[PDB]
Amino acid sequence: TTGRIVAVIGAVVDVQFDEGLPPILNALEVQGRETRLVLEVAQHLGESTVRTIAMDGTEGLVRGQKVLDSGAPIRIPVGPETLGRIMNVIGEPIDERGPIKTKQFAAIHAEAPEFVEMSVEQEILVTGIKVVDLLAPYAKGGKIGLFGGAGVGKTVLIMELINNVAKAHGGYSVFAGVGERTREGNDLYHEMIESGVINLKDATSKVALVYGQMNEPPGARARVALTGLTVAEYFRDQEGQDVLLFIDNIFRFTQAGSEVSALLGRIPSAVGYQPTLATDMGTMQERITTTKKGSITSVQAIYVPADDLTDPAPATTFAHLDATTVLSRAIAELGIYPAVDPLDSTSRIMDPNIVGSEHYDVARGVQKILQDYKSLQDIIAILGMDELSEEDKLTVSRARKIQRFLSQPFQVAEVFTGHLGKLVPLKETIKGFQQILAGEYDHLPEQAFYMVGPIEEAVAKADKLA
Amino acid sequence: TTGRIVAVIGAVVDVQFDEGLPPILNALEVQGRETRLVLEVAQHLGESTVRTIAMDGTEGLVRGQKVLDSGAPIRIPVGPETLGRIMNVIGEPIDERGPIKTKQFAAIHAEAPEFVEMSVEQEILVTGIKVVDLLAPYAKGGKIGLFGGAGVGKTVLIMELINNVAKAHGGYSVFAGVGERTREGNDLYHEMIESGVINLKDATSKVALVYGQMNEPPGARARVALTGLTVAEYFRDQEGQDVLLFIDNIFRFTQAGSEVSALLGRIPSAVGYQPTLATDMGTMQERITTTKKGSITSVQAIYVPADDLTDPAPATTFAHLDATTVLSRAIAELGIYPAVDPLDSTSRIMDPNIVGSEHYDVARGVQKILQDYKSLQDIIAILGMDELSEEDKLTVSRARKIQRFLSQPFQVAEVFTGHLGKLVPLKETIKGFQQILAGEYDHLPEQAFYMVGPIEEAVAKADKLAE
Amino acid sequence: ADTSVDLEETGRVLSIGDGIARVHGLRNVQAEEMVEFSSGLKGMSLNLEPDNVGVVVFGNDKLIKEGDIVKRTGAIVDVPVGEELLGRVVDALGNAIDGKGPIGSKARRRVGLKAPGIIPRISVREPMQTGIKAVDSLVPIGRGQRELIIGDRQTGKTSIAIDTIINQKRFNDGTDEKKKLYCIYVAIGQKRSTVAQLVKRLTDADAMKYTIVVSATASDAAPLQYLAPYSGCSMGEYFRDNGKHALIIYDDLSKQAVAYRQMSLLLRRPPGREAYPGDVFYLHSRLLERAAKMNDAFGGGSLTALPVIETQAGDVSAYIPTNVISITDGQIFLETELFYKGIRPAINVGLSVSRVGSAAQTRAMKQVAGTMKLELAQYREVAAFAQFGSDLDAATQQLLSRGVRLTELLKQGQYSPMAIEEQVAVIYAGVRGYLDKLEPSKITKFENAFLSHVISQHQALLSKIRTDGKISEESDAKLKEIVTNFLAGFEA
């Protein structure tokens, strides 16, 4: 079918059809352009007109221009030949390595797995990161979220996890760059090549890359997540594969939505966001999941605007995760990295019947002492410690030593910590924290605990501090 | 006249009349319904189409449905045969006891008493509640308001006043439940009966009841108060009696209006409210009043959205009252019931010329010390108490004891406090506080002053606590 | 003369977008009636305008296009109801989603029915035992009562509800049909894997047998999420209107409000305070008024509701939070501060209330916890006023000594709902002062030891307290004897 462009406003192109109106979600190709311009139908305004969302800049379009119904929704190359390749929202390669020659093609809009298809196995995923492992442990096939205001550690944490987990993972990985920096895509691609997870020589690549960055028009940013998502769904269900899915940043998808929403003509909801915010997050978040057919461990970075976690975007995302790592500017500014807020991160696995009571008791032990320190802080703030009880001062000592022992050097952040990256084994974490709690190091100085791996290194640092 | 329904959107129904357009406020009845559906005309949209508010559910209505102009605003059965009964927004019995055979009928919409009809007598109305009496005395025939956020004591306080005052009152009482809990009208009805204020066998009923609860459509909620108030105005004017009016909760009248407001095509005023809030409240509040003909003693519960007393609604209502009892979740949270805020409650009779200087000097004496203590609170919080002057650590003492002596076990909250309800007489109150202020109990423990009636119980409780 | 598509019982889609169809025709539809789309997709007639009908769509509007035929159903929205649903997982319309076969429903019920009036009910008097000391002792819940569970994300709100559902086996596995409680669990805006996790645990606890689970999750259309509560309510009234007893959990009413807000804005209804419809109070009042206690004249059955609301930054004064606190018969407020501090449940004594009071409590419980609530309130205050031991007397040293010991007893783990007599035994120990000399840290351990002893050895005293339902003078004497002696041997 051939329609005609009737109106153009930014990324919202209205096209009229005479015979055969395309259903909603169908991709149309604008005619008469140097490059592909896909339009995704969004709604039937009546009068044989359809309101659509462009997938690329709309400059140059002209009213009356011809548009062709592709007959289906954006469809993209899916299969193992996407492994080691970089692709677009609309599935075209952007790594200058030729066509992605796949047997099948999948449409980016699918329904979420049914209730009966759900899984409930809960396995802990150890990452080697002290704070995460001890207090808000991730889980295989689970959904993890790293909340962070600008420049707090979301990406560095994804990188370190890619290093500590993705690197020795049997099975595939999918990295979806949504609304982030292009240089980062470039930094990663080349790094992936270097460590050999991307091999441009053989078919041994274990990573497929999808990108729709900070330079794309809203509609592209609004759909690349769906695109990375689809790639991952193929490995899960069509190959019963155990997938790893990294997304930086899923907040950008929602923001993209807010960008076009006025153009679609909608009364805004709170904070200027689109009234369809939750459902849009929902039908999308619900496909990022493990099932009986396959496993999807997904780590999603969630940018928090103005640092406000009460913002509709981040606020609505908590409910979709199994584990959350809430990063803090306040902590970061103290020099504690990763800047994880220990009393604000959680994990549905923090259950005695899953991590064992030893783990469950150290975990709750650490939080209780930090919570206690937290209430003393108001008074410590005007009057310092003098007036504090001998007992209260011991919580304070221990709390400040536990707070420091929660920090740790990442390989990925070596250039900034000035120290060699460390990976601490769970039992080493459970332990080191026990002792601290138990008063076995009340003699060491705080600084001994800052930026170290295992407790054994904290004792040493103390000697060196003399 | 006969109009047709042209549009239905929630509680708002637009009707088109071919000949004869029913005036604004007129009630129309929808034809073809198992139950009586009344539509109050709200506006003349033009083109012989009127916009109206439904007095009940709009389910099953159809475009084109017939509607007859009743020729007059909602009119209800008013008179003595309303006593002991339960009525609707539209005046229908809802107690299953048959028709209400009144001689007359009254339209719920009417003008408020003229300026030359006002009265200025000011008699204290003792309630038995320490706090109210001491600091914000109610006045017979005056307008009283109980302000409070969700769950701080508005209703229980209205409940103990019905007991300590309505029960002995020689005159009628009208209790209008506006947008509150259905469970509650059933608790009160059956309590009225078990205590004979309502008599189902004879004509000894001394209370009429009107209800438009929270399970009703905005429309019903925007009018029950009118129905309630209308019943009360009859006993005031046509009989000339001393009426007691209880409304719980008048905020619901205003929330009702804000709920249809947008469907009435209006730009919102601040906080979401409708632009006609104050005037809507004014033409109503101005009828709830004592005149030279009769006397009304209205006790209105006033909900405070988000606990914010500056919210356009609670905020707009202060001016309509002669006495105000402000309840606070911060006080309640401490276990101090009734949770009245001693520094935010006021009465127009707190005048030496009206209650006397002993009453007055005590009240103000109690308020100064609570204020004095409020100011220090945040500071001894951090800097501690050692540095304080013995002069100042005595006011911390006395204040903390007064704070308690102001609580009281209500007779309607034993299910809550696990304590027998106490009613204290005005002189037992004035005296008790006078002595605490005088230093006459600086030896007893604070706890001795918590949840007790008269000061003697605080002394006895000290011993019991003495071990 | 093909006359199947006249514009009185059928219409044609003028336009469709974001789940709202503007249907032309449908001249005889009734407000709130259900209509059908060519695609087998059902919708509901919300705006009846002069020239069009605004239809909310119960499903993906992607299958709807301009021109489609829409057919009346003649029926105002309703749903399957009755005992057939027990043990099954249904969507917001009644359809099964446990792929365990069709529901054998013989009854139907309108999702939107006004709550029974004044006359048909009777004061709440029968307890609804949660299994949680803190709750059953301080903020008692009776049948026909609405008690709200409110708190920030992850403070434990759902747990309160699960423990409650699980605690009901006691009576359901029993003989007495009046003590039985059928449960309904409505998930709204939640995630399918979480619900799947939820129904697993219920199954593992042998609780599904008496539970129905209405699920309206994160990807379900706004209108399904919106309806879900009314749907589930109606299934609970079946039991309520037939002299049976039901318990419904609305988890949570926050996500529904969002759904309502979305559905509503997309219909172009002017946004109000905080962007929600001017009638969000009404949205929840209408629903929760339906939980009720009917008099013997109407079967004496009941419906008890436990709606959940999520606060932000523990701010309970917030507009929605207070909107709902002003409808229910009390609230259970959970704080993250208390939770991290070790106080789990994180119930905030001071801020939680039960408007039913002791009328929803057995005499055994009333006897032990009659004044405890205001005691703990008064304890929290002085505990603050002496965060500097300000030359404190005895009456307050005693107050702080009880306060701490009692606080430890109200603590509780998950999935282990206690029996009423078990609660009375342990609170008893504290409230009576027998524990005023034990070390706070000991208290939890003591309660496990003590309870062990009485359950094993003394079930005669437990069965009597349980049976008489009160604490007689001899039971009270047999108890004093046990605690004091066991306590001593315990502190050897």
DSSP string, B318-345: GGG-SEEEEB-HHHHTTT-SS-B-TTS-
Closest residue on chain C to A111 (Cα): C219
Give yes or no for A382 touching B (CB within 8 A). Answer: yes
CB contact under 8 A, B182 and C118: yes
Look at residues B349, B380, B407 and tell me which one is the last residue of a structural domain. B349
List, as ranges, residues 7-36 from A with C-beta within 8 Å of C.
Answer: 21, 23-25
Number of domains in chain A: 3
Look at residues B73, B103, B137 and tell me which one is the last residue of a structural domain. B73
Which of B8, B59, B183 is closest, CB to CB, to C292?
Answer: B183
Domain extent listing, chain C: 6-75, 76-361, 362-492
State the DSSP string of C302-318: EEEEEEEEE-STT-TTS
Coil, helix or strand for A271?
Answer: helix
Helices B277-285, B251-261: inter-axial angle, 10-degree rounding: 140
For residue A195, give the CATH number of its domain: 3.40.50.300
Q: Which fold has domain C6-75?
A: Elongation Factor Tu (Ef-tu); domain 3 (2.40.30)
Residue B263 sits in the same domain as residue B359: no
Resolution in A: 6.0
Beta strand pairing call for C33-37 and C42-48: antiparallel
Residue B273 sits in the same domain as residue B381: no
CA gap B388, A160 in Å, rounded: 56
Look at residues A44, A73, A102 and tell me which one is the last residue of a structural domain. A73
Positive or negative CA dihedral for C260, C262, C268, C269? Answer: positive
Q: Does domain C76-361 have CATH number 3.40.50.300?
A: yes
Express the helix, strand and coil content of chain C in percent, nearest 5 each.
40, 20, 40
Domain coverage including residue A284: 74-349
Residue A131 sits in the same domain as residue A212: yes
Residue A129 sits in the same domain as residue A196: yes
Residue B106 sits in the same domain as residue B178: yes
Question: Which amino acid makes up residue C150?
Answer: I
Distances (CA, A) of B249 to A251, B74, B216, B347: 43, 21, 14, 20
Q: List chain B gaps (C–N > 2.5 A) by preceding residue.
A: none
Residues A212-216: contacts with CB within 8 Å, 24+ apart? A212/A88, A212/A89, A212/A177, A212/A178, A212/A179, A213/A177, A213/A178, A213/A179, A213/A180, A213/A181, A213/A182, A213/A185, A214/A179, A214/A180, A214/A181, A214/A182, A214/A252, A215/A182, A216/A56, A216/A89, A216/A179
Question: What does residue A248 show for φ and ψ, rounded to 5 degrees?
Answer: -135, 110
Question: Do C166 and C327 contact (CB within 8 A), yes or no?
Answer: no
Marked catalytic residue, from A180, A236, A287, A404: A180
Which of C15, C63, C98 is closest, CB to CB, to A46?
Answer: C15
Residue B356 sits in the same domain as residue B446: yes
Rounded to the nearest angstrom, the minimum Cα separation between C229 and chain B is 15
Distances (CA, A) of C462 to B91, C171, C430, C467: 55, 16, 17, 8
Residue B130 sits in the same domain as residue B203: yes
For residue B37, give the CATH number of its domain: 2.40.10.170
CB contact under 8 A, B384 and A382: no
Question: In chain C, what residues touch A269 (CB-CB under 8 Å)?
Answer: 261-262, 265, 271, 275
Question: Do A332 and A307 contact (CB within 8 A), yes or no?
Answer: no
State the binding site of A for ADP: 151-156
Question: Do B143 and B320 contact (CB within 8 A), yes or no?
Answer: yes
Residue A437 sits in the same domain as residue A293: no
Residue A325 sits in the same domain as residue A384: no
How many residues belong to chain A?
A: 466
Residue A160 sits in the same domain as residue A306: yes
Q: Which helix (H) or strand (E) segment is B347 a member of?
A: strand B346-347
CB contact under 8 A, A278 and C259: yes
Give yes or no for B386 touching A (CB within 8 A). Answer: no
Question: Do B87 and B42 contact (CB within 8 A), yes or no?
Answer: no
List, as ranges, residues 184-213 from B with C-beta within 8 Å of C.
Answer: 185-187, 189-190, 211, 213
Beta strand pairing call for B173-178 and B242-248: parallel
Give yes or no for A270 touching B (CB within 8 A). Answer: no
Question: In chain C, what residues touch B416 (CB-CB under 8 Å)?
Answer: 357-358
> Cis omega (within 30 of 0) on the bond before A80?
no
State the binding site of B for Mg(2+): 155, 180
CA gap B425, C443 in Å, rounded: 45
Question: In chain B, what residues touch A387 (CB-CB under 8 Å)?
Answer: 384
CA gap C206, A114 in Å, rounded: 24
| Residues contacting residue B211 through CB under 8 Å, at least 6 positions apart | B86, B87, B88, B94, B176, B177, B185, B224, C118
Closest residue on chain C to A291 (Cα): C193
Residue B333 sits in the same domain as residue B264: yes
Please count the residue pairs, one from chain A and one from chain B, whose beta carbons lie less than 8 angstroms apart.
6
Residues paired with residue A13 on neighbouring β-strands, in sequence order: A8, A52
Chain B interface test: which of A267, A375, A376, A379 (most B C-beta within 10 Å) = A379
Q: What chains are in contact with A, requiring at least 3 Cβ pairs below 8 Å?
A: B, C
Comparing C-alpha atoms, which of C427, C429, C439 is closest to residue C486?
Answer: C429
Marked catalytic residue, from C108, C192, C355, C380: C355
Active site residue A236: no
Distances (CA, A) of B350 to B32, B123, B203, B347, B359: 57, 11, 39, 6, 9
Active site residue C146: no
Helix residue spans in A91-245 (DSSP H)? 130-135, 154-164, 182-194, 218-233
Q: What is the CATH number of domain C362-492?
A: 1.20.150.20
Marked catalytic residue, from B40, B160, B180, B259: B180
| Residues contacting residue B357 through CB under 8 Å, at least 6 positions apart | none
Residues paired with residue A213 on neighbouring β-strands, in sequence order: none
The CA-CA-CA angle for residues B443, B446, B448, to 5°, reads 90
Residue A109 sits in the same domain as residue A63: no
Question: In chain C, what residues touch A276 (CB-CB under 8 Å)?
Answer: 18, 262, 266
For residue B428, give the CATH number of its domain: 1.10.1140.10
